[PDB]
Ligand binder design. Structure first.
Ligand code: ADP
Ligand code: MG
Length: 1361
């Protein structure tokens, strides 16, 4: 069942991107190499935002750049057909493949018509062209270049979204190789039908993104950035798109090249089509289920059943329109491959996986203070570099008038003085825009607070004289404070009149004048509103004399037109007639009001629109614009009451809703500014950080239950903005519906695709649309799509309006192609509101009633009685949809089936061991002792290692290839393919490599392979450092004091560090092994050391996330061994002390701690049980504690969610075998029968192949000594255990660790264990290589170590002695 299989495989392939077989980037000949890509990443990192814009954004905007036809012509093939249709350009060219010539289809976005902006008929032409090439078995090269598909009134009237939803449906289901190549810009839903290819490439200077970079300006205004900053933060370069896995490589060609690089475009196409065809043949070799899918699709062409045959007639889709034009078996392979690549381009995580931010050192109401500080920061930056007064002739001529009239004999002085400051305050009001109110308050406060040595300061010479320098002088200072105070009241007056513009519009429609009382009372109310929302000392009478002075300036109309130009960005909801009457009120009716103050007969109030412009149909456009403002107001009242939520939508019709994967959420690997704060805020409110809620519900159809799928949009997160986690939840729901045979109902509301998830979010349009296309075409069950609230962007432009679904809308739904954030200017309710679109053909199967908004249909009939009304109910549509289906006999109910190892835990007689070295020798020895056959996997140096020699004829050895870890053990797909091939009973994930990764645990358990260790839930809870601390806090276990969540920035790190007291630690969340652990001594150091250690974490792991802990200088590293079964018996075996360590790596490890009180030992035993039971832990695990020697306290640090190398020390002293107990637990057995003891004492020395050598100051260090071992004797002794890979004639490899043996001594007491281990280390012989043993012998003959008085920093001090 290929529909179920493609989500399984694509989930597997997205768990480890680098070593997946979805990497076809090696195949294509003519791409740039990974070295040039790494070098280009270093340049783009070191450049600023302007250098990034020049490199990336400016060449795709270039009007001199070769078009789609010119690029296709310079492939130098033979053109067979062309179809130029506006900004669409389809073609068909024969290319030479060396063996012969071949027809290759083309569909391109042509930049030399409409800039590549596609219209509805261009999408319908792309639909047709994609079938036409499929019917003729022609491979297709898509060429992407667009500002996005048109969001205009004509597009949405022609049903733009419904043409794109079909175009994506054809592209996703085409039966020929599809290659995408970005030849310019790939923005939004116009780029995704073409970018939905098998292999998506880009030219060297191309771009691919969620929307055009100027559309990010709305999100830039909300968080106080520029749109250029938001564009770099999103990461839109071809190099960054290749790093995120959005594209499959960068072709070494730009459209203007005429050297060797012009030949790379045809070569990249030839090798791409050949690569997809070789890959698709390899998929038909290995997939026997691809035959079954093809035979099921063939059987529908043989016998077209009436319910799907009627859907194919109405939908017009790419089907077998002939037996000759019926697709081949490889045709279904291109659909399959295309889904796997689209679905591994999208990526999401879970709530347990996401690392929580620090609540510690965060002020109350912080958001407004941080935005105030950003507005002050940009204001202080203007105080540090203000503009010169020579730059504008209008301001320059007023300075000349001012200085001339200042020496002249007092009226002309006062006129020129006031006029200079006035035009400076309008100039800064044009400049500062949406933040102008805040920056004028800060300018007033600045001017009042200025030193007398700056207020009395005489002006610089004209060339160095700035607009700041002009107004800071005392003579211009306090009148400019007055200008700024009146401009604040004007900005409030203007914005209050804009929000009250409907009252003006009504009276203009019904009398053609705005009466004198209506302009008086609107002016009164707007000044009273301005001076009651602002406590400013400048009163109504002073502002009235300024308003007369302003209405006495000759450039007053020009000041209103300049203002209106930048205000049009913030108010894209008003039409031309509404902007004209707004301007006419300020320009003419306010002067006419003053002129008629002396004599009221001079007032007429008459709006003459011709004096602002000869706009046709002015009063009928004013009628439409007023009706649309009332529709906007009604939909804002509906948002503010908040009746259409996911809970309320469910309670109106459905009962016992069971959500599928409610924990799925945004990955956020671009880390967009303020978006992680929004994920935190959502989580603290209990809201899903995901644009969709999905589940299965009961619907009582005439008292009797019917089980249906239910997908309701989450208007509680980002107004229902659809996301990569929403796409995975939709695929999961359609899979549960395909398994159980459920009808699907959907309620969809969205602001569009989540732009703050990167360019990767776009692929969700094609992923979810393909799963709905395949769901109806393989499983027949009806999908309903009730568009509600605002239903816009890519959710609207794909799956909601898809031609096989029954599309519905609630009354009052806003349904355009894109929303207010992206739309440049006003769109009529005739082209946006679902009421007027109800009778427009193909827009919907019906407009239904909104069951929450009581009076809506009468409120809409009072706005326009000729508006089309709703007819059907949501209950009527659902009962008619359910009753016309065949009622198949329902199976007995199953739960939502998830990854559970406990089901897979069956008796083990053959096991895969994922390990090398001493860990593999230990696990191979335990496999013999438990009577289990080993399937061993190994690198080329390790095929002839001692763990391979320890195997029998009944045990297997398999070659992974290569020398290093990357070429062998870290390839998870090779290791899983061996587990599947040998049919292994379980897989032991070893130690090191992928042992502690919950992704590698999930990868095995997806494919039904038993993972020997904890559940994936237990691994993510105690593997995520913030959540491990939060679970410890919940179980009354003291943690190592710190931030407790993850730090945001250097200011956060300073404040949490100050509260703990310096010195302190900075640690990486994805760290471990002592990597990136920086000590910070001071606040002076912390500012530089945070930025530094964030770069260490980002370089080492690809995540700069730091979290802070208290630096304890005198400690013991105490760690406590847990065992636990599936039944819940937390058998805690005992502790170890691993304090003799060198660069965090443990060296001399012990079964007890000589400075730890028995009361604190009992506390860490109780805390291990509390954590083990409260996470539902399984297998072997080790919780780590800092035992502060100064404080006499024990603090939880972190947990090992796997087998620990120190384990044979506790095997001796507990009397319990840790690996045998873990193999019993992973066979499904209980460990209740075990009795943990405290048998004597034990100690381990890690014997490593290292030579002594001095550092730069002369202190002795140990460093690795590789080479062939000539002699190696470990004498047989009863109270020592030897795990070893050292023997005569074996080599110690430079590609791996110097660990050559673990020597674990046992004895009665600690002095006896030390003395026996000292004597045993002298009886042990090693030759050929050097070893660490000269140091180990001296620690065992130290007096301070023999007394047991030391700390974790003992060893580097002792090596210096
Ligand atoms: N402030 C500190 N207090 C205690 N240990 C610290 C501190 N800073 C670094 N460390 C080292 O890190 C240990 C904590 O576990 P860690 O070494 O990070 O584990 P791993 O690297 O094996 O995951 C401590 O025992 C100590 O050796
Ligand atoms: Mg450690």
């Amino acid at each position: 069942p290929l529909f179920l299989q493609a989500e399984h495989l694509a989930k597997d392939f997205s768990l480890f991107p680098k070593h997946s077989k979805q990497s076809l980037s090696e195949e294509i000949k003519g791409l740039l190499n990974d070295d040039a890509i790494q070098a280009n990443l270093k340049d783009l990192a070191s450049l600023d935002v302007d250098g990034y814009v020049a490199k990336v954004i400016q060449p795709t905007q270039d009007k001199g750049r070769p078009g789609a036809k010119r690029i296709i012509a310079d492939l130098k093939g033979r053109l067979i057909t062309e179809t130029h249709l506006g900004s669409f350009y389809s073609a068909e060219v024969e290319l030479n493949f060396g063996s012969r010539t071949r027809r290759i289809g083309f569909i391109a976005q042509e930049r030399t018509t409409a800039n590549g902006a596609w219209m509805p008929e261009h999408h319908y032409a792309a639909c047709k062209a994609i079938r036409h090439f499929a019917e003729l078995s022609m491979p297709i090269v898509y060429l992407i270049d667009t500002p996005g598909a048109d969001a205009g009134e004509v597009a949405n009237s022609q049903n733009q979204a419904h043409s794109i939803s079909k175009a994506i449906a054809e592209s996703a289901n085409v039966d020929v190789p599809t290659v995408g190549i970005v030849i310019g810009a790939g923005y939004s839903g116009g780029a995704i039908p073409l970018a939905a290819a098998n292999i998506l490439l880009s030219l060297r200077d191309g771009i691919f993104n969620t929307i055009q970079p100027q559309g990010l300006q709305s999100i830039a205004r909300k968080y106080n950035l520029s749109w250029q900053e938001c564009a770099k933060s999103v990461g839109v370069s071809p190099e960054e798109l290749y790093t995120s896995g959005c594209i499959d490589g960068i072709i070494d060609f730009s459209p203007g090249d005429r050297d060797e690089r012009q030949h790379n475009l045809r070569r990249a196409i030839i090798s791409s089509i050949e690569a997809v065809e070789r890959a698709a043949v390899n998929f038909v070799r290995e997939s026997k289920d691809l035959r079954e899918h093809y035979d099921r699709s063939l059987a529908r062409f043989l016998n077209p059943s009436k319910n799907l045959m009627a859907l194919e007639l109405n939908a017009e889709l790419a089907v077998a329109t002939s037996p000759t034009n019926h697709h081949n078996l490889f045709g279904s392979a291109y659909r399959y491959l295309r889904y796997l690549t689209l679905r591994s381009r999208i990526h999401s995580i879970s709530q347990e996986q996401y690392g929580r931010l620090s609540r510690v050192s965060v002020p109350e109401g912080d958001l407004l203070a941080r935005i105030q500080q950003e507005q002050d920061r940009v204001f202080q930056a203007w105080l540090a570099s203000p503009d010169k007064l020579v730059y504008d002739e209008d301001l320059n001529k007023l300075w000349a008038n001012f200085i001339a009239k200042r020496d002249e004999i007092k009226e002309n002085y006062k006129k020129a003085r006031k006029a200079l400051l006035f035009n400076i305050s309008w100039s800064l009001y044009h400049r500062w825009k949406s933040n102008a109110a805040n920056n004028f308050k800060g300018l007033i406060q600045h001017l009042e607070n200025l030193p007398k040595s700056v207020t009395q300061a005489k002006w610089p010479e004209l060339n160095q004289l700035t607009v700041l320098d002009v107004v800071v002088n005392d003579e211009l200072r306090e009148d400019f404070i007055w200008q700024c105070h009146n401009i604040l009241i004007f900005n409030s007056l203007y914005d209050n009149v804009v929000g009250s513009l409907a009252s003006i519009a009504k009276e203009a429609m019904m009398s053609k004048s705005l009466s004198r009382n209506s302009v008086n009372n609107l002016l009164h109310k707007s000044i009273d509103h301005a001076l009651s929302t602002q406590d400013t000392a400048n009163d109504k009478a002073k502002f009235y004399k300024w308003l007369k002075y302003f209405m006495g300036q000759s450039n007053r109309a020009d000041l209103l037109v300049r203002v209106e130009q930048w205000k049009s960005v913030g108010f894209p909801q008003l039409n031309d007639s509404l902007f004209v009457i707004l301007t006419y009120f300020f320009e003419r009716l306010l002067p006419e009001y003053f002129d008629s103050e002396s004599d009221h007969s001079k007032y007429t109030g008459a709006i003459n629109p011709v004096r602002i412009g000869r706009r046709k149909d002015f009063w009928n456009r004013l009628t439409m614009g007023y009706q649309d403002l009332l529709i906007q107001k009604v939909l804002r009242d509906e948002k503010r009451t908040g009746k259409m939520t996911w809970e309320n939508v469910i309670k109106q019709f459905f009962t016992h809703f069971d959500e599928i994967n409610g924990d799925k959420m945004s990955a956020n690997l671009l880390n967009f500014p303020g978006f992680r704060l929004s994920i935190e805020d959502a989580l603290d409110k209990g809201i899903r950080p995901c644009g969709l809620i999905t589940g299965i519900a009961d619907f009582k159809e005439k008292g009797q239950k019917v089980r249906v799928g239910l997908a309701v949009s989450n208007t509680a997160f980002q107004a229902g903005a659809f996301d990569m986690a929403s796409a995975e939840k939709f695929s999961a729901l359609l899979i549960e519906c395909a398994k159980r045979k459920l009808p699907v109902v959907c309620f969809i509301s969205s602001g569009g695709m989540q732009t703050k998830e990167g360019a990767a979010a776009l692929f969700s349009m094609a992923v979810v649309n393909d799963r709905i296309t395949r769901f109806i075409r393989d499983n027949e069950l009806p999908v309903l799509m009730f568009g509600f609230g605002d239903c816009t962007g890519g959710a609207q432009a794909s799956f909601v309006t898809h031609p096989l679904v029954q599309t519905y809308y609630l009354s009052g739904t806003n349904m355009p192609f894109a929303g207010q954030m992206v739309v440049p200017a006003y769109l009529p309710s005739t082209s946006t509101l679902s009421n007027y679109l109800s009778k427009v053909p193909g827009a919907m199967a019906g407009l239904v009633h909104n069951p929450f908004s009581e009076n809506l249909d009468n409120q809409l009939a009072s706005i326009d009685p000729l508006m089309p009304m709703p007819t059907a109910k949501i209950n009527e549509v659902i009962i008619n949809a359910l009753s016309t289906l065949v009622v198949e006999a329902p199976a007995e109910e199953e739960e939502i089936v998830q990854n559970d190892p406990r089901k897979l835990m069956k008796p083990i007689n053959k096991v895969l061991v994922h390990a090398r070295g001493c860990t593999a020798v230990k696990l191979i020895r335990k496999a013999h002792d438990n009577n289990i056959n080993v399937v061993l996997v190994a690198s080329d140096p390790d095929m002839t290692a001692v763990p391979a020699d320890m195997l029998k004829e009944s045990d297997k050895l398999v070659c992974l290839g290569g020398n290093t870890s990357d070429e062998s053990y870290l390839n998870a797909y090779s290791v899983l393919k061996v587990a599947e091939y040998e049919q292994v009973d379980a897989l032991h994930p070893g130690i090191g490599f992928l042992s502690e990764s919950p992704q590698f645990a999930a990868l095995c358990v997806n494919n039904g392979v038993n993972f020997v260790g904890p559940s994936v839930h237990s691994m993510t809870t105690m593997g995520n450092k913030s959540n491990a601390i939060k679970t410890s806090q919940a179980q009354n276990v003291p943690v190592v004091p710190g931030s407790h969540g993850i730090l945001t920035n250097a200011e956060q790190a300073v404040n949490v560090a100050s509260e703990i007291g310096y010195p302190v630690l900075l640690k990486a969340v994805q760290g471990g092994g002592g990597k990136g652990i920086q000590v910070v001594k001071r606040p002076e150091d912390m500012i530089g050391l945070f930025q530094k250690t964030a770069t260490e974490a980002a370089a080492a792991f690809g995540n700069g996330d730091l979290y802070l802990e208290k630096y304890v200088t005198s400690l013991r590293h105490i760690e406590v061994q847990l065992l636990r079964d599936k039944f819940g018996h937390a058998k805690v075996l005992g502790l170890r002390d691993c304090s003799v360590q060198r660069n965090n790596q443990k060296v001399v490890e012990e079964s007890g701690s000589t400075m730890l009180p028995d009361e604190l030992k009992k506390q860490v035993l109780a805390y291990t049980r509390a954590l083990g039971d409260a996470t539902d832990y399984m297998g072997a695990g080790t919780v780590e504690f800092i035992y502060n020697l100064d404080a006499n306290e024990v603090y939880f640090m972190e947990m090992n969610t796997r087998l620990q190398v120190a384990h044979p020390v506790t095997e001796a002293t507990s009397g319990i075998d840790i690996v045998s107990a873990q193999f019993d637990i992973a066979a499904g057995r209980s460990i209740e029968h075990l009795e943990p003891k405290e048998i004597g004492y034990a100690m381990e020395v890690r014997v490593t192949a290292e030579k002594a050598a001095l550092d730069s100051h002369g202190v002795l260090q140990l460093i690795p000594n590789p080479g062939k071992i000539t002699e190696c004797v470990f004498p047989d002794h009863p109270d020592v255990e030897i795990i070893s890979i050292a023997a005569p004639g074996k080599e110690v490899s430079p590609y791996y660790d110097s660990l050559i043996a673990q020597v674990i001594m046992r004895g009665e007491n600690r002095e006896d264990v030390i003395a026996k281990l000292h004597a045993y280390l002298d009886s042990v012989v090693l030759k050929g290589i050097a070893t660490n043993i000269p140091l180990l012998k001296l620690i065992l003959s130290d007096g301070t170590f023999k007394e047991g008085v030391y700390d974790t920093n003992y060893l580097p001090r002792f090596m210096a002695e």
